[PDB]
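Hey, can you fold this one?
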Amino acid sequence: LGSPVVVRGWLHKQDSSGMRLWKRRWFVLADYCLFYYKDSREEAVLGSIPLPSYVISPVAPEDRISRKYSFKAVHTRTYYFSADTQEDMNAWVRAMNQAAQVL
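Sure. Predicted structure:
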């Protein structure tokens, strides 16, 4: 990966299907995209989310997420994310919106 990185670290990503369980992955925001890995070795990339035209917004009322410090990226498909702290949630939403918002 020769891209410059905006931010890295742990987030919980809710699964699409199954029991919709929250998984802890290592996330890298680089080149206007989220890359997720098992861990911080950032060796084998599990998934990719190109962020342009995705709206990242906290705590979707109807979406009834029980877990705290949770936010969502909607493909204006939606992904649900959760940080360990309020500070992290804010840093991530800023970062993702900067990448997403192409005016």
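Residues 44 and 82 are 22 Å apart (CA to CA). Let me know if you want another pass with a different chain boundary.
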